[PDB]
């Protein structure tokens, strides 16, 4: 409340640490369905069904230009990429499996880097 704050958690390294996590996501071998935006002219259904499309390259541009107010907004965009993938692809597909693997990989790095 007014003039009463919890102790200040140090957030001065967060920009650089999110950048590293993203770099490792980008270089993983199962990253290929997620490196560029889904092509909305060539993938019937995608535009109407997926209300907020997201991908690594778009996350990378937002990060580099100060469009994330804090580390939680960054994690929300990362999770959106895999939530969209689950919405559109069957679990028993290569892209479906790539998504489950990448989300597991992300959530470990997130815990270990910050918690």
Swiss-Prot record:
Occurrences of domain Bromo (ranges): 9-113
Biological function: Regulatory subunit of the ATP-dependent BRF-1 and BRF-5 ISWI chromatin remodeling complexes, which form ordered nucleosome arrays on chromatin and facilitate access to DNA during DNA-templated processes such as DNA replication, transcription, and repair. Both complexes regulate the spacing of nucleosomes along the chromatin and have the ability to slide mononucleosomes to the center of a DNA template. The BRF-1 ISWI chromatin remodeling complex has a lower ATP hydrolysis rate than the BRF-5 ISWI chromatin remodeling complex.
Known tissue expression: Expressed at varying levels in several tissues, whereas a smaller transcript was expressed specifically in testis.
Subunit structure: Component of the BRF-1 ISWI chromatin remodeling complex, at least composed of SMARCA1 and BAZ2B, which regulates the spacing of histone octamers on the DNA template to facilitate access to DNA. Within the BRF-1 ISWI chromatin remodeling complex interacts with SMARCA1; the interaction is direct. Component of the BRF-5 ISWI chromatin remodeling complex, at least composed of SMARCA5/SNF2H and BAZ2B, which regulates the spacing of histone octamers on the DNA template to facilitate access to DNA.
Name of the gene encoding the protein in the UniProt record: BAZ2B
Organism taxonomic ancestry: Eukaryota, Metazoa, Chordata, Craniata, Vertebrata
Subcellular location: Nucleus
Identification of the protein by name: Bromodomain adjacent to zinc finger domain protein 2B
Transmembrane segments: none
Family under the similarity heading: Belongs to the WAL family.
């Amino acid at each position: 409340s007014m003039s009463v704050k919890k102790p200040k958690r140090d957030d001065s390294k967060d920009l650089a640490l999110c950048s590293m996590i993203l770099t490792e996501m980008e270089t993983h071998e199962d990253a290929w369905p997620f490196l560029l935006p889904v092509n909305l002219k060539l993938v019937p259904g995608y535009k109407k069904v997926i209300k907020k499309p997201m991908d690594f390259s778009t996350i990378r541009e937002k990060l580099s230009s100060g469009q994330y107010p804090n580390l939680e907004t960054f994690a929300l965009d990362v999770r959106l990429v895999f939530d969209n993938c689950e919405t559109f692809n069957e679990d028993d597909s290569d892209i479906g499996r790539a998504g489950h693997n990448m989300r597991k990989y992300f959530e470990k790095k997130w815990t270990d880097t910050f918690k």
